[PDB]
Amino acid sequence: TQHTSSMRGVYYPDEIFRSDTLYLTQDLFLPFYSNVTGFHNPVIPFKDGIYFAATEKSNVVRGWVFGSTMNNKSQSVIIINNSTNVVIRACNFELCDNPFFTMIFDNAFNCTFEYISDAFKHLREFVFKNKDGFLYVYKGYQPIDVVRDLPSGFNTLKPIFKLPLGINITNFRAILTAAAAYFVGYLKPTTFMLKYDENGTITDAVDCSQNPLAELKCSVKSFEIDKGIYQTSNFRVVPSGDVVRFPNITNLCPFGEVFNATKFPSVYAWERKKISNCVADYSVLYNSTFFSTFKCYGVCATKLNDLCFSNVYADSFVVKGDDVRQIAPGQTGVIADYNYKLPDDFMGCVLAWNTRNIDATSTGNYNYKYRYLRHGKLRPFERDISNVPFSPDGKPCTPPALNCYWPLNDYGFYTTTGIGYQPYRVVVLSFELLNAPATVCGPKLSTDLIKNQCVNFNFNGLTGTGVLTPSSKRFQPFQQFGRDVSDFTDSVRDPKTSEILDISPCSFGGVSVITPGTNASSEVAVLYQDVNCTWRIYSTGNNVFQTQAGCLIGAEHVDTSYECDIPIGAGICASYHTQKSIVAYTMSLGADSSIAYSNNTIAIPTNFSISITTEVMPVSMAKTSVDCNMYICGDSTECANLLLQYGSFCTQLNRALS
Amino acid sequence: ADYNYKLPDDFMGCVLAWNTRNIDATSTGNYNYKYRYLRHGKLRPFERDISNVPFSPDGKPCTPPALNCYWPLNDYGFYTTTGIGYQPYRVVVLSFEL
Amino acid sequence: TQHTSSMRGVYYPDEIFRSDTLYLTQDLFL
Amino acid sequence: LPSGFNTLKPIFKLPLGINITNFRAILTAAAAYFVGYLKPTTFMLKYDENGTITDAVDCSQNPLAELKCSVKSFEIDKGIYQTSNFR
Amino acid sequence: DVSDFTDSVRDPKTSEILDISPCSFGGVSVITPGTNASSEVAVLYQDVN
Amino acid sequence: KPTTFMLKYDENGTITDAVDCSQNPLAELKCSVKSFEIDKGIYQTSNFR
Amino acid sequence: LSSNFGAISSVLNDILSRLCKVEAEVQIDRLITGRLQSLQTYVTQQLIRAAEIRASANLAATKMSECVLGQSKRVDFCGKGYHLMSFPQAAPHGVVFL
Amino acid sequence: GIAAEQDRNTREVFAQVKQMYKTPTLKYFGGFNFSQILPDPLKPTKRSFIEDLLFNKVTLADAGFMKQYGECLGDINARDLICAQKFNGLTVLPPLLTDDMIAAYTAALVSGTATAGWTFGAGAALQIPFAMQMAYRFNGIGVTQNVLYENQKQIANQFNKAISQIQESLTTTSTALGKLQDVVNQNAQALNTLVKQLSSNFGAISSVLNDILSRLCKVEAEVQIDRLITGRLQSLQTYVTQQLIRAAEIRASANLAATKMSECVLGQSKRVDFCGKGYHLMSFPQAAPHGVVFL
Amino acid sequence: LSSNFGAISSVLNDILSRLCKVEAEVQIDRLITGRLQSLQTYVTQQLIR
Ligand SMILES: C=CC1=C(C)/C(=C/c2[nH]c(/C=C3N=C(/C=C4/NC(=O)C(C)=C4C=C)C(C)=C\3CCC(=O)O)c(CCC(=O)O)c2C)NC1=O
Ligand SMILES: *[C@@H]1O[C@H](CO)[C@@H](O[C@@H]2O[C@H](CO)[C@@H](O)[C@H](O)[C@H]2NC(C)=O)[C@H](O)[C@H]1NC(C)=O
Ligand SMILES: *[C@@H]1O[C@H](CO)[C@@H](O[C@@H]2O[C@H](CO)[C@@H](O)[C@H](O)[C@H]2NC(C)=O)[C@H](O)[C@H]1NC(C)=O
Ligand SMILES: CCCCC/C=C/C/C=C\CCCCCCCC(=O)O
Ligand SMILES: *[C@@H]1O[C@H](CO)[C@@H](O)[C@H](O)[C@H]1NC(C)=O
Numbered sequence A: 001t002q003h004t005s006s007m008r009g010v011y012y013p014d015e016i017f018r019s020d021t022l023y024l025t026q027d028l029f030l031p032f033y034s035n036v037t038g039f040h041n042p043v044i045p046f047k048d049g050i051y052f053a054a055t056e057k058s059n060v061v062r063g064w065v066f067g068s069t070m071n072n073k074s075q076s077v078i079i080i081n082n083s084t085n086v087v088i089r090a091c092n093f094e095l096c097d098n099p100f101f102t103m104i105f106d107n108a109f110n111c112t113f114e115y116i117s118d119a120f121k122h123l124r125e126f127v128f129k130n131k132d133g134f135l136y137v138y139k140g141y142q143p144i145d146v147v148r149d150l151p152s153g154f155n156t157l158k159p160i161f162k163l164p165l166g167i168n169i170t171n172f173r174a175i176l177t178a179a180a181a182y183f184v185g186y187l188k189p190t191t192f193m194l195k196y197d198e199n200g201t202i203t204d205a206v207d208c209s210q211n212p213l214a215e216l217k218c219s220v221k222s223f224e225i226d227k228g229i230y231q232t233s234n235f236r237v238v239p240s241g242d243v244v245r246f247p248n249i250t251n252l253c254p255f256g257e258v259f260n261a262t263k264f265p266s267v268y269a270w271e272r273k274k275i276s277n278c279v280a281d282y283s284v285l286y287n288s289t290f291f292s293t294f295k296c297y298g299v300c301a302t303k304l305n306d307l308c309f310s311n312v313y314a315d316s317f318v319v320k321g322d323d324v325r326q327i328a329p330g331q332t333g334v335i336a337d338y339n340y341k342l343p344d345d346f347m348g349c350v351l352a353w354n355t356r357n358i359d360a361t362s363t364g365n366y367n368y369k370y371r372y373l374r375h376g377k378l379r380p381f382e383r384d385i386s387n388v389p390f391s392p393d394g395k396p397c398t399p400p401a402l403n404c405y406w407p408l409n410d411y412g413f414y415t416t417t418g419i420g421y422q423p424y425r426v427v428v429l430s431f432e433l434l435n436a437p438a439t440v441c442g443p444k445l446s447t448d449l450i451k452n453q454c455v456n457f458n459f460n461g462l463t464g465t466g467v468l469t470p471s472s473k474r475f476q477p478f479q480q481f482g483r484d485v486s487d488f489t490d491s492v493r494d495p496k497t498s499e500i501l502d503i504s505p506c507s508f509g510g511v512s513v514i515t516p517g518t519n520a521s522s523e524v525a526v527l528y529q530d531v532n533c534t535w536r537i538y539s540t541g542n543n544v545f546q547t548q549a550g551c552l553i554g555a556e557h558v559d560t561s562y563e564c565d566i567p568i569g570a571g572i573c574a575s576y577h578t579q580k581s582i583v584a585y586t587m588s589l590g591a592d593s594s595i596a597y598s599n600n601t602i603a604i605p606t607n608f609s610i611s612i613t614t615e616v617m618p619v620s621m622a623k624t625s626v627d628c629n630m631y632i633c634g635d636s637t638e639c640a641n642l643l644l645q646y647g648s649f650c651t652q653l654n655r656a657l658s
Numbered sequence B: 001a002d003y004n005y006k007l008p009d010d011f012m013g014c015v016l017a018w019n020t021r022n023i024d025a026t027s028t029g030n031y032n033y034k035y036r037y038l039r040h041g042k043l044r045p046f047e048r049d050i051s052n053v054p055f056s057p058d059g060k061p062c063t064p065p066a067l068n069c070y071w072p073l074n075d076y077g078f079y080t081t082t083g084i085g086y087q088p089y090r091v092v093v094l095s096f097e098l
Numbered sequence C: 001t002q003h004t005s006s007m008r009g010v011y012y013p014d015e016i017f018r019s020d021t022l023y024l025t026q027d028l029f030l
Numbered sequence D: 001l002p003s004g005f006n007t008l009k010p011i012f013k014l015p016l017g018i019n020i021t022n023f024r025a026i027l028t029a030a031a032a033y034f035v036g037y038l039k040p041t042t043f044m045l046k047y048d049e050n051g052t053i054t055d056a057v058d059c060s061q062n063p064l065a066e067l068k069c070s071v072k073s074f075e076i077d078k079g080i081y082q083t084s085n086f087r
Numbered sequence E: 001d002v003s004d005f006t007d008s009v010r011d012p013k014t015s016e017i018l019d020i021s022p023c024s025f026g027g028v029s030v031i032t033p034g035t036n037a038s039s040e041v042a043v044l045y046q047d048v049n
Numbered sequence F: 001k002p003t004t005f006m007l008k009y010d011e012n013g014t015i016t017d018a019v020d021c022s023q024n025p026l027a028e029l030k031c032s033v034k035s036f037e038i039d040k041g042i043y044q045t046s047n048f049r
Numbered sequence G: 001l002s003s004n005f006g007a008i009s010s011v012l013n014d015i016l017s018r019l020c021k022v023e024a025e026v027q028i029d030r031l032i033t034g035r036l037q038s039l040q041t042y043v044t045q046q047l048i049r050a051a052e053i054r055a056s057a058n059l060a061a062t063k064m065s066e067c068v069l070g071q072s073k074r075v076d077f078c079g080k081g082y083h084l085m086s087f088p089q090a091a092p093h094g095v096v097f098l
Numbered sequence H: 001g002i003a004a005e006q007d008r009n010t011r012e013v014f015a016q017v018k019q020m021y022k023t024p025t026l027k028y029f030g031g032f033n034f035s036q037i038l039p040d041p042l043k044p045t046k047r048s049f050i051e052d053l054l055f056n057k058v059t060l061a062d063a064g065f066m067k068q069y070g071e072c073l074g075d076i077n078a079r080d081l082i083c084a085q086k087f088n089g090l091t092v093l094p095p096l097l098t099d100d101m102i103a104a105y106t107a108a109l110v111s112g113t114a115t116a117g118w119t120f121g122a123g124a125a126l127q128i129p130f131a132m133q134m135a136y137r138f139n140g141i142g143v144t145q146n147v148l149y150e151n152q153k154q155i156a157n158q159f160n161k162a163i164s165q166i167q168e169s170l171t172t173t174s175t176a177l178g179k180l181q182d183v184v185n186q187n188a189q190a191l192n193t194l195v196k197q198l199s200s201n202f203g204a205i206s207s208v209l210n211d212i213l214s215r216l217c218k219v220e221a222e223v224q225i226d227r228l229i230t231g232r233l234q235s236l237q238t239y240v241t242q243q244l245i246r247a248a249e250i251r252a253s254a255n256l257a258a259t260k261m262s263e264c265v266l267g268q269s270k271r272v273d274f275c276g277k278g279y280h281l282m283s284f285p286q287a288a289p290h291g292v293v294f295l
Numbered sequence I: 001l002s003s004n005f006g007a008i009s010s011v012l013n014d015i016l017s018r019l020c021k022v023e024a025e026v027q028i029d030r031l032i033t034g035r036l037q038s039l040q041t042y043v044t045q046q047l048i049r
């Protein structure tokens, strides 16, 4: 009831035609030699996309149904082939218990998509992949003749459909008429390397995760490796689990106190309030309050959740309609110069909404003022609520003088005036991130702590991968995070337990692959340089032994010593010897001999020989040259004009080559 | 952007929109346009959710009169004599490839 | 009246824990 | 004033929108108080493993500390070195 | 290509196949006896008949 | 016409000599070396032609 | 030449054909910097390899004068044993001494 | 390529004997005492006395080659450098020839010099009394054989006293092995710099990749991650270029050591100041960490 | 030092004088990167020679 799949599920990733190339790509593929489930009807889940194969001879498997909920309260799509035609239909079907082949649906309503095709043992295979509101279908056909299972082979799949459906697809179900069999496998995000022949089709492909040999093939970017020893990627441990930690905060933030306040101050006398110990759940504002302006500097609005803030201040005031564009970094005007100033390196969010009913009355509302005369501009986050008469020279005066005015000017708000002369309430929120203990924090759900293996962690918005260990550092009360010499985040404080945790990565140690050449065989040995296997190895082996260099898996340890063929290290060498196999030994220094020393005897030659010996020495190499303009820019004129500004690189390069 | 219509981060296309008050708004009140304001998550790019079932914050199936059981769709109220922020706008989004 | 500071007025730059570290900064110092 | 070395810790920062250009002390009705001005300069610090900031050097008083800032260490071997500008 | 330079295109009217290649090829070398000497030069085109 | 030229300025800010880069192989050599006086030998040039 | 170096495409024609002027001059300079750095790395490797070739050629030149034009008394400088004489032969990019 | 060149360097310097010779039980060859340059059988180490003295002087940066995960996962309270190097992807590989094999090679060379003389290098091992070999070498430098034979005893005494002087001077003086130790230090220094350059933000918003990915969108994080990637790639390229330049100098020194072993240990040289100051008689090789010492 | 490396100027004062922090710390970074690369190339050539 379960089988394996090998070299199944390769399709064209693009519409680019290329030939005689080895292209490398990374996306959702079915892994090589992976588990598939066989059926000879349940509700099979989707989870990322599906590889679906059907061995049949009498055409009994026809079409599918995809949908989140199989009731009629959701939206579902059927891809069915009746006796004469292929019809795709996305609607609100009430799915019967047995979708028998016609009459699968009892009724259909409120519906969006319909496609109807032209009038219409062996194996048919499909790949269904859903992303960005598009359902991609790939199809391949193979004339096989075996019956218990899926035959091992390499077959490519071609694109036929991408359907524009906005559907939650979490479940699917096949449709049967009434022998044959159908098999289901799950796609995963992996890296593959393909090969393109002269005609332009794909003939071979290799995974980069099943084997160390596959990792080496992807690294060197070839399908043929000579005899030797090669350094591959270090030993990786995949994360299995998740920990999410957040402080003990229950109550929500005072949205009604800040936004729905009875009155707001003037812009020259703006008011600042501290926000602390609350959960920023702004989705409760989706019913009453709506904002004409909302812009965030420093962070993304989508990342306003999943994140946890340190020191939040709210500044509130009232401006008129066309002054709201002055509440920004790097602006000039009457508000930005003399009333309210934002720093250049500002992290926060500015949000403003129109209040004409509550602030503008008939016959005027002259209660809001702004300053338009001042000796110099304001510093960031400063206010000046003084009221003294202003004279341009810089001398005190009296307001009935000629060069003596009042520095404040009244806003005039009426009910019947254009939007540029209407009241607007503005709130500026300021905060910093990843700097201090956090008291106002985002809405999430916490998870219990795991202290042994590699997990994804989320500590107050700090996201990463590693292992969590108990530590013994001494944090001051104002310190939340610690960093290393390379500014890695080594230590953290738990917001619930208040213990100190130490974070280190979960990949460690170098790996080498020893091969006798892919032409000779397809067997390899693996050397783990810093483990003691007398573990932290991966999948398997038959012979495991500990050299002075490290742990060797896949080789036989002989006792006799020969000359060195493939140098492993620390006195250990290895070769391919006779059914041939890889053997490892200690290298031989030379032929053993001895000569006796005596103080009254001497050895004298009585014959000679003439010997000629060859010695090869390199003398020269190839002379090369480069056109700097043709290599960098080609034939583009605009590139050449932009390249003229990079003076004295190409001359300095041609001079060296000459 | 959360419960009704979502655009991808790597979006190639054009967004255009124009004001239609004389054809979409009446003095009595045009209540023919709705929007979802309650959902159990955020939409993915170019997805749709046309479903009117009662909503409860805990997550259990509900009966429409209850303590905390709500209808998820609100109605736009489009009167003629209202400010520019409450007037109807028609939006067309064009998606390309090159 | 007149006096001399002689290595006075050094304060913590940040709120980050640092151990076995050497660290160079520009700021308003005495 | 003693000539020793001591580090200072943060206690509080206040959100005040004020030009502070003058200040004055408040005294009850023998003891002394000393006032010095801050200037924007570069310092080089050295922390303790389990403890606090223990060492700190300027880069402008003498050419020797300029050398210490150019090499970025406290222990210097015998010889001649080229120094940067911090004066 | 291997260098991601477009070579082949299908003509959208006649549905034939066309190949684009650069219009610049070959190395050109100039041999001079000196600008202080005469102003005549010799030109060598590398690897062409 | 849109072409490539090389100029020269004196010690009084005055322009005195200039050369086009698309009339001669010698002029192409002058523009590639970026000088007015060229020593004896064989040089490899750009393609301003 | 097929790398992006942080730009939107490795094909310069696409960038120049679909983008505005100022935005194209930002995407182009990344490709220019990347290709200059690649070509600089190649030249540095060639300069390092030429030194090893020159040292080998110096040894081959001093071994021609002291072993082909004379008889050397330095141990194992020209073959194993007592050196009688030596002959040169040409080889592709090299020399072979008998 | 650099690592393969290092192994070839060691092999070309040391493996110059076609066959290995057993050290004699008698270290006293006609008044010349060879006890301090040949291995001691009862002593646990298979190096000489002088080789032990040379190995003690170079404070070798202990390269591990067995640093398990639990050893670096523990001992966090001491911020070790090799743990940080291995955590950031930097690895040091062990040499092909261990120290014992090099000591065996040098013991075979000295045993061949004490018994066969100058003939095993340029042919077969032809044994000869040591005094006749010294007479031949005096004849080589221009002095007749009777000068050796008349006053052999005080020549042997001077030889033994000079060996004693060398052994004494390698127990106190520190700077003597300055060219080897520097090499070790240089490598370590470069590799340590490759860790500290991970703290530079390269004109981005932060040096930590997690914070950049955690508080920004896709397109805004692409620019910062690209700046970090470019900076770290060029830092690694700078490291590799410096290593390639240093390896050429190491190779030139190893070539000189190989020709000195060939022309001064296996023979007698008439080149002026090629092997010592004065008229050359013979030389003895001793092993050292990443190097050789000629007497 | 006269290369702008695709910035608005090869002079630092002009960039600092007609722009603000967020925008002017982008051009200065490009100038800094180009000048460090040129100094690195010079030191590499000297080390080889
Ligand atoms: C189930 C959905 C379904 C899809 C997506 C479909 C697509 C499809 N089937 C095709 C061929 C074909 N379609 C059928 C009939 C069938 N009767 C069945 O129940 C099944 C599953 C098939 C096979 C898809 C046959 C017999 C062929 C010709 C295959 C051959 O003999 O080479 C083709 C033309 C080949 C091409 O364009 O390259 C398409 C596009 N047909 C379908 O029925
Ligand atoms: C697509 O529809 C499915 C079906 O409802 C959604 O799955 C639910 O997701 C919410 C939010 O996480 C959970 O509370 C529910 O328990 C899920 N349903 C079931 C039956 O478990 C899915 O989230 C939808 N996708 C998107 C992007 O909104
Ligand atoms: C803070 O107050 C000081 C003192 O009142 C202000 O300094 C004055 O600046 C104006 C500007 O030309 C001068 O004419 C005055 O002579 C200054 N006063 C003194 C006493 O010298 C300062 O401007 C205020 N802060 C800000 C940011 O404006
Ligand atoms: C028209 C004569 C001056 C022409 C040259 C101008 C030089 C200075 C540049 C811009 C100043 C123009 C007025 C800007 C007013 C800002 C008003 C505001 O934002 O609140
Ligand atoms: C397939 O299932 C078997 C049965 O448990 C399991 O041992 C095997 O690991 C599975 N295959 C993979 C690739 O996980």
Ligand SMILES: *[C@@H]1O[C@H](CO)[C@@H](O)[C@H](O)[C@H]1NC(C)=O
Pocket (backbone or CB within 6 Å): A072, A094
């Ligand atoms: C289908 O929807 C209708 C309302 O449109 C409902 O009355 C009916 O019960 C639904 N079908 C099932 C099987 O519940």
Ligand SMILES: *[C@@H]1O[C@H](CO)[C@@H](O)[C@H](O)[C@H]1NC(C)=O
Pocket (backbone or CB within 6 Å): A082, A083, A084, A085, A087, A116
């Ligand atoms: C198959 O479905 C199509 C679309 O409804 C219809 O036109 C056609 O007649 C059907 N064929 C059969 C045999 O039912």
Ligand SMILES: *[C@@H]1O[C@H](CO)[C@@H](O)[C@H](O)[C@H]1NC(C)=O
Pocket (backbone or CB within 6 Å): A109, A110, A111, B050
């Ligand atoms: C769905 O159908 C119901 C009645 O069947 C109707 O009231 C509602 O407007 C429809 N919704 C859509 C989006 O078509």
Ligand SMILES: *[C@@H]1O[C@H](CO)[C@@H](O)[C@H](O)[C@H]1NC(C)=O
Pocket (backbone or CB within 6 Å): A198, A199
């Ligand atoms: C594919 O390439 C081969 C080359 O061996 C050629 O013979 C064949 O005709 C090509 N296929 C087509 C459809 O042209």
Ligand SMILES: *[C@@H]1O[C@H](CO)[C@@H](O)[C@H](O)[C@H]1NC(C)=O
Pocket (backbone or CB within 6 Å): A287, B070
């Ligand atoms: C949204 O506002 C309406 C208006 O009265 C109210 O009836 C409804 O309960 C509000 N929603 C929630 C979740 O409180």
Ligand SMILES: *[C@@H]1O[C@H](CO)[C@@H](O)[C@H](O)[C@H]1NC(C)=O
Pocket (backbone or CB within 6 Å): A248, A495, A496, A497, A498
């Ligand atoms: C926070 O919640 C945890 C839950 O176990 C509790 O142990 C702790 O005392 C609470 N308070 C603080 C200040 O951590």
Ligand SMILES: *[C@@H]1O[C@H](CO)[C@@H](O)[C@H](O)[C@H]1NC(C)=O
Pocket (backbone or CB within 6 Å): A532, A534, H066
């Ligand atoms: C590996 O473990 C064995 C277990 O007995 C131990 O004897 C050996 O010394 C260990 N290896 C090293 C290098 O210490």
Ligand SMILES: *[C@@H]1O[C@H](CO)[C@@H](O)[C@H](O)[C@H]1NC(C)=O
Pocket (backbone or CB within 6 Å): A606, A607, A608
């Ligand atoms: C030396 O050896 C050769 C064989 O190579 C032999 O023919 C010759 O007779 C030998 N000479 C003497 C003197 O034995």
Ligand SMILES: *[C@@H]1O[C@H](CO)[C@@H](O)[C@H](O)[C@H]1NC(C)=O
Pocket (backbone or CB within 6 Å): D049, D050, D051
């Ligand atoms: C650690 O701190 C304690 C004070 O809590 C102090 O007594 C001890 O000396 C410190 N240890 C070191 C190594 O500085």
Ligand SMILES: *[C@@H]1O[C@H](CO)[C@@H](O)[C@H](O)[C@H]1NC(C)=O
Pocket (backbone or CB within 6 Å): E012, E013, E014
């Ligand atoms: C226009 O394009 C069509 C392809 O649909 C082609 O058959 C035709 O020859 C072209 N030219 C004219 C003049 O129609």
Ligand SMILES: *[C@@H]1O[C@H](CO)[C@@H](O)[C@H](O)[C@H]1NC(C)=O
Pocket (backbone or CB within 6 Å): E048, E049
């Ligand atoms: C041009 O020269 C090439 C090589 O020198 C030669 O193969 C070719 O035949 C020549 N062309 C003619 C037309 O002779």
Ligand SMILES: *[C@@H]1O[C@H](CO)[C@@H](O)[C@H](O)[C@H]1NC(C)=O
Pocket (backbone or CB within 6 Å): H028, H033, H034, H035, H036
């Ligand atoms: C040779 O020297 C060693 C150490 O100097 C000494 O122990 C030994 O007795 C000497 N051999 C003699 C004097 O025969």
